[PDB]
Design an enzyme around this catalytic site. Structure first.
Site, short mmCIF file in Angstrom:
data_model
loop_
_atom_site.label_atom_id
_atom_site.label_comp_id
_atom_site.label_asym_id
_atom_site.label_seq_id
_atom_site.Cartn_x
_atom_site.Cartn_y
_atom_site.Cartn_z
N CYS B 108 -5.03 4.94 -11.44
CA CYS B 108 -4.68 3.53 -11.29
C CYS B 108 -4.68 2.77 -12.58
CB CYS B 108 -5.54 2.80 -10.22
SG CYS B 108 -5.26 1.04 -9.97
N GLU B 285 7.32 0.58 -9.85
CA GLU B 285 7.08 1.17 -8.54
C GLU B 285 8.29 0.97 -7.61
OE1 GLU B 285 2.84 0.80 -7.05
OE2 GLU B 285 2.92 -0.90 -8.44
C1 HEM Z 1 -3.99 -5.25 -8.36
C2 HEM Z 1 -2.91 -4.66 -8.86
C3 HEM Z 1 -2.76 -3.19 -8.96
C4 HEM Z 1 -1.83 -2.59 -9.73
C5 HEM Z 1 -0.75 -3.28 -10.57
C6 HEM Z 1 -2.01 -1.20 -9.53
C7 HEM Z 1 -1.17 -0.24 -10.13
C8 HEM Z 1 -1.14 1.06 -9.64
C9 HEM Z 1 -0.04 1.93 -9.77
C10 HEM Z 1 1.24 1.57 -10.47
C11 HEM Z 1 -0.44 3.13 -9.29
C12 HEM Z 1 0.41 4.39 -9.18
C13 HEM Z 1 1.34 4.05 -8.01
C14 HEM Z 1 2.30 5.18 -7.79
O1 HEM Z 1 2.98 5.60 -8.75
O2 HEM Z 1 2.42 5.71 -6.66
C15 HEM Z 1 -1.73 2.98 -8.75
C16 HEM Z 1 -2.45 4.01 -8.17
C17 HEM Z 1 -3.66 3.76 -7.50
N1 HEM Z 1 -4.35 2.55 -7.45
FE1 HEM Z 1 -3.75 0.89 -8.10
N2 HEM Z 1 -3.07 -0.94 -8.74
C18 HEM Z 1 -3.55 -2.11 -8.29
C19 HEM Z 1 -4.64 -2.37 -7.41
C20 HEM Z 1 -5.36 -1.36 -6.75
C21 HEM Z 1 -6.26 -1.58 -5.71
C22 HEM Z 1 -6.61 -2.94 -5.11
C23 HEM Z 1 -6.78 -0.36 -5.35
C24 HEM Z 1 -7.80 -0.11 -4.30
C25 HEM Z 1 -8.91 -0.87 -4.19
C26 HEM Z 1 -6.13 0.63 -6.16
C27 HEM Z 1 -6.37 1.98 -6.15
C28 HEM Z 1 -5.39 2.83 -6.62
C29 HEM Z 1 -5.47 4.26 -6.28
C30 HEM Z 1 -6.57 4.92 -5.45
C31 HEM Z 1 -4.38 4.84 -6.86
C32 HEM Z 1 -3.96 6.33 -6.84
C33 HEM Z 1 -3.32 6.79 -5.51
C34 HEM Z 1 -2.88 8.23 -5.47
O3 HEM Z 1 -3.52 9.14 -6.05
O4 HEM Z 1 -1.84 8.54 -4.81
N3 HEM Z 1 -5.29 -0.01 -7.03
N4 HEM Z 1 -2.22 1.71 -9.07
N1 LIG Z 2 0.77 -1.65 -7.00
C1 LIG Z 2 -0.04 -0.73 -6.41
C2 LIG Z 2 -1.33 -1.07 -6.02
C3 LIG Z 2 -2.17 -0.12 -5.43
C4 LIG Z 2 -1.69 1.17 -5.19
C5 LIG Z 2 -2.47 2.15 -4.58
C6 LIG Z 2 -1.97 3.42 -4.34
C7 LIG Z 2 -0.66 3.73 -4.70
C8 LIG Z 2 -0.07 5.10 -4.46
C9 LIG Z 2 0.73 5.19 -3.18
N2 LIG Z 2 1.47 6.44 -3.20
C10 LIG Z 2 2.49 6.77 -2.21
C11 LIG Z 2 2.91 8.23 -2.39
C12 LIG Z 2 4.27 8.58 -2.31
C13 LIG Z 2 4.66 9.91 -2.48
C14 LIG Z 2 3.71 10.90 -2.72
C15 LIG Z 2 2.36 10.57 -2.80
F1 LIG Z 2 1.44 11.52 -3.03
C16 LIG Z 2 1.96 9.23 -2.64
C17 LIG Z 2 0.12 2.75 -5.31
C18 LIG Z 2 -0.37 1.47 -5.55
N3 LIG Z 2 0.42 0.51 -6.13
#
Ligand code: HEM
Ligand SMILES: Nc1ccc2ccc(CCNCc3cccc(F)c3)cc2n1
Ligand code: HEM
Ligand SMILES: Nc1ccc2ccc(CCNCc3cccc(F)c3)cc2n1
Ligand SMILES: C[C@H](O)[C@H](O)[C@H]1CNc2nc(N)[nH]c(=O)c2N1
Ligand SMILES: C[C@H](O)[C@H](O)[C@H]1CNc2nc(N)[nH]c(=O)c2N1
Ligand SMILES: [Zn+2]
Lengths: 407, 411
Positions: B108, B285
């Site tokens: 993240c 995204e």
């Molecule tokens: C507040 C603005 C936030 C931004 C701009 C942000 C940005 C991102 C982005 C761009 C990704 C990768 C998304 C993707 O390519 O699928 C991501 C992954 C993630 N974020 Fe955030 N995030 C935010 C808030 C949060 C919040 C609120 C949580 C949970 C409390 C969180 C937990 C995660 C987790 C767990 C992942 C990885 C998910 C995976 O492995 O598939 N994020 N974040």
């Molecule tokens: N802007 C944000 C904020 C929080 C987020 C938390 C998790 C994710 C990841 C969601 N991923 C969807 C996905 C799509 C395809 C394959 C895979 F493993 C997962 C994006 C966020 N994007």
């Protein structure tokens, strides 16, 4: 033990067994992944020789033949005796091609088996190395129709008699720090540029001065040589639509030729092994031109495009980046110098991975390096799971010579 | 054992000691790196050590480690474990827990925001209708008429693994996908399978290109139930371009609230299998992945057509050109409608500052480079040049199997 990699765009699943042969280590453990770190005796030598010869003899469908056992015997006796051994030409060529084949960071490996190997093991002096190098440069350049090649200098013996090319690539632009504060030319080479100067090079002190070769034979002090200008093919950078582009005064060289690496074949170390192929466009246009610690020209190009540089969210950097890269590709193609775009290189590599999974049981690949530095997810390699592991023969990094050399 | 990471643009070197607190495994070994692999019922036995380590961390963060309250709390949790086989978190430990799982999420890029997380405690929730009500409140709070606020809603934890709370949807708000009999897809291809499950459960599909899916909600291991989110609660942004007037005619829009609903929150050995959370979008995204993946809306060709780029060779970089234009459009539209969004330059720069701060105050920041680096213009963002160490800390967010694969239908 049998590992799966999935392509998330195509669902294609490949099974990897080649990794079970992996011999060197990765940097990673079960507790920590180091995938994004840039750099992570007689006794030792015989197993290394054996492992190599076993794979060499298997590759020519002669595993466990009298020829195989005889050579194993022969090399064994030679190690026992001399404490080293010599590769047959055939083994040398195989070794080199396979080091490319095993280069997990190389997207261009579809080409691996078309590699011209120049055996310069009979070399003894820096002047000889210079002759070998100019021959390599001219052969590979082929007036713009580039061909892959490697030139292999004598192998390390006792580490006191190393051959080395001090240059990082055979062809590169000088970089000079200015009173000014900023940097004229290429900032990556400032230190090497001073080492040349402090060894005697009269620098033209321009933005795009081809560096002199600094060649070390047999552990001696390295010597300077100017590559005949006629052998250095360069490309003036213009844009197919922006006339003002030419006035930026940008040019780049056609031949990417990495010269500071170490080639390891069957435990033997080839510390001077300059090799070359041809450029993927992004290498020049994304990295060389736009890295903040490189030519860093994004700001200037955006200006000439009259883009809104007030807010990052206009994506002016991104808009300019694409134009710079269009221009690089256009110039090379116009002048008929071989170049590949990132769409085509990455598409090739997916096909190559497929071939390797099918013919060899896998393909070590470093996703962090394979995915291009622009437009990552619109290239197929972004969506491709990759397993990274270290096979031998290999190319390896080695410490910059000036830190080592007993001057 | 200290570990260093270098930034190759700035030469700034950082030292990591935090990776020493790391417990879970990576997938990698000394012989293979699995850093690009997408995905790499507890006894009293394994539970008390997990609870202890968690409460040791919580008590340390509030500067009360080894206090009477710390000790009394360990004893009380222990007693509760051996008597009931599980335990309940105090409100405060839940809050801390949910924040730390975000702080610890190595993929993240938005984590600068980790401490501003609105935690909604839905552990008194018992039914799917109760879940629907909690989720609407979440959506309305998080949305806040375009001025997005981070939030997480936390439904009851797993007990015997047969009474699970789950949100079947992968995000609270997502568009339907419909595989057509000629093999073409309508709407978002990612959501076809799930769209199909909703239909079957009885959703009447409008069958458009941007139909907001209904919520499919499982309480207490019961079969899931359908619900429609009130449309007035679903904020959406029509996509247009600042200079290209034909862009509107592509008919594109997106929703403002990214709200991931299918992950599992682990806190102190406890498993919260329904824990939807939301933030705000980074523009790429939507503009890179949602619009331009071949497997998603795939609008690159139609956009390059309208721009009349040279499409006869990839080496014109028509694809890269269209990609930038679409992403300019996404940001322009969001900002014009005053809906929170961050561009990838801003977000990655923030992340680098978050990371350095974390190394200084926390002794590390686990980070997954493969995921942190944006899917366009990688090397002109500061993260590209930043070495990173990836390791797994708890509390944490984890993947879990899609529930249609595991659920025992009651009928
Ligand atoms: C507040 C603005 C936030 C931004 C701009 C942000 C940005 C991102 C982005 C761009 C990704 C990768 C998304 C993707 O390519 O699928 C991501 C992954 C993630 N974020 Fe955030 N995030 C935010 C808030 C949060 C919040 C609120 C949580 C949970 C409390 C969180 C937990 C995660 C987790 C767990 C992942 C990885 C998910 C995976 O492995 O598939 N994020 N974040
Ligand atoms: N802007 C944000 C904020 C929080 C987020 C938390 C998790 C994710 C990841 C969601 N991923 C969807 C996905 C799509 C395809 C394959 C895979 F493993 C997962 C994006 C966020 N994007
Ligand atoms: C024929 C055209 C070729 C193409 C298009 C190509 C492409 C690439 C690219 C783009 C990189 C990453 C470069 C960077 O970002 O610095 C790379 C890395 C590499 N390639 Fe190639 N390659 C080619 C030929 C070769 C040849 C001939 C060899 C050796 C015989 C080779 C061995 C390597 C090695 C060892 C690396 C990684 C170096 C490192 O780790 O720093 N490649 N390749
Ligand atoms: N087109 C090609 C062909 C072959 C190549 C071989 C190696 C490299 C990498 C150049 N290595 C310089 C370097 C890059 C990054 C870190 C570092 F220490 C050193 C690029 C190629 N580019
Ligand atoms: C920190 C990070 O490992 C470093 O910037 C890498 C990332 N990926 C790369 N990829 C390629 N092809 N070349 C590089 O020099 C780098 N640099
Ligand atoms: C195979 C590969 O790991 C996979 O495509 C990953 C790469 N990096 C990513 N990075 C982000 N932010 N989101 C993703 O979905 C992916 N996909
Ligand atoms: Zn790893």
């Amino acid at each position: 033990r049998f590992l799966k990699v999935k392509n998330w765009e195509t669902d294609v699943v490949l099974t990897d067994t080649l990794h079970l042969k992996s011999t060197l280590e990765t940097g990673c453990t079960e507790h920590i992944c180091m995938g994004s770190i840039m750099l992570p005796t007689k006794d030792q030598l015989f197993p290394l020789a054996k492992e190599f010869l076993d794979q060499y003899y298997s590759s020519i469908k002669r595993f466990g033949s009298k020829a195989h056992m005889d050579r194993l015997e022969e090399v064994n006796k030679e190690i026992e005796s001399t404490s080293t051994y010599q590769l047959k030409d055939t083994e040398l060529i195989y070794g080199a091609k396979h080091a490319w084949r095993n280069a997990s960071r190389c997207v261009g490996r579809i080409q691996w088996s078309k590699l011209q190997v120049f055996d310069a093991r009979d070399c003894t002096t820096a002047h000889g190395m210079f002759n070998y190098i100019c021959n390599h440069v001219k052969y590979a350049t082929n007036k713009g129709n580039l061909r892959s090649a490697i030139t292999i200098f004598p192998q390390r013996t006792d580490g006191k008699h190393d051959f080395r090319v001090w240059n990082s690539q055979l062809i590169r632009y000088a970089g000079y720090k200015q009173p000014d504060g900023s940097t004229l030319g290429d900032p990556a080479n400032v230190q090497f540029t001073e080492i040349c100067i402090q060894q005697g090079w009269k620098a033209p002190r321009g933005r795009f001065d081809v560096l002199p070769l600094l060649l070390q034979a047999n552990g001696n002090d390295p010597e300077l040589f100017q590559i005949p200008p006629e052998l250095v093919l360069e490309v003036p950078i213009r844009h197919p639509k922006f006339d003002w582009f030419k006035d930026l005064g940008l040019k780049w060289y056609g031949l990417p030729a990495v010269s500071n690496m170490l080639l390891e074949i069957g435990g033997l170390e080839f510390s001077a092994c300059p090799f070359s192929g041809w450029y993927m466009g992004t290498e020049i246009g994304v990295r060389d031109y736009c890295d903040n610690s490189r030519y860093n020209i994004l700001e200037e190009v955006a200006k000439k495009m009259d883009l809104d540089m007030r807010k990052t969210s206009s994506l002016w950097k991104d808009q300019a980046l694409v134009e710079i890269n269009i221009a690089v590709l256009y110039s090379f193609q116009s002048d008929k110098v071989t170049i590949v775009d990132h769409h085509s290189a990455t598409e090739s590599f997916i096909k190559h991975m497929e071939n390797e999974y099918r013919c060899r049981g896998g393909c070590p690949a470093d996703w962090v390096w394979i995915v291009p530095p622009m437009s990552g997810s619109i290239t197929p390699v972004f969506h491709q799971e990759m397993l990274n592991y270290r096979l031998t023969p290999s190319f390896e990094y080695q410490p910059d010579p000036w830190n080592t050399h007993v001057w």
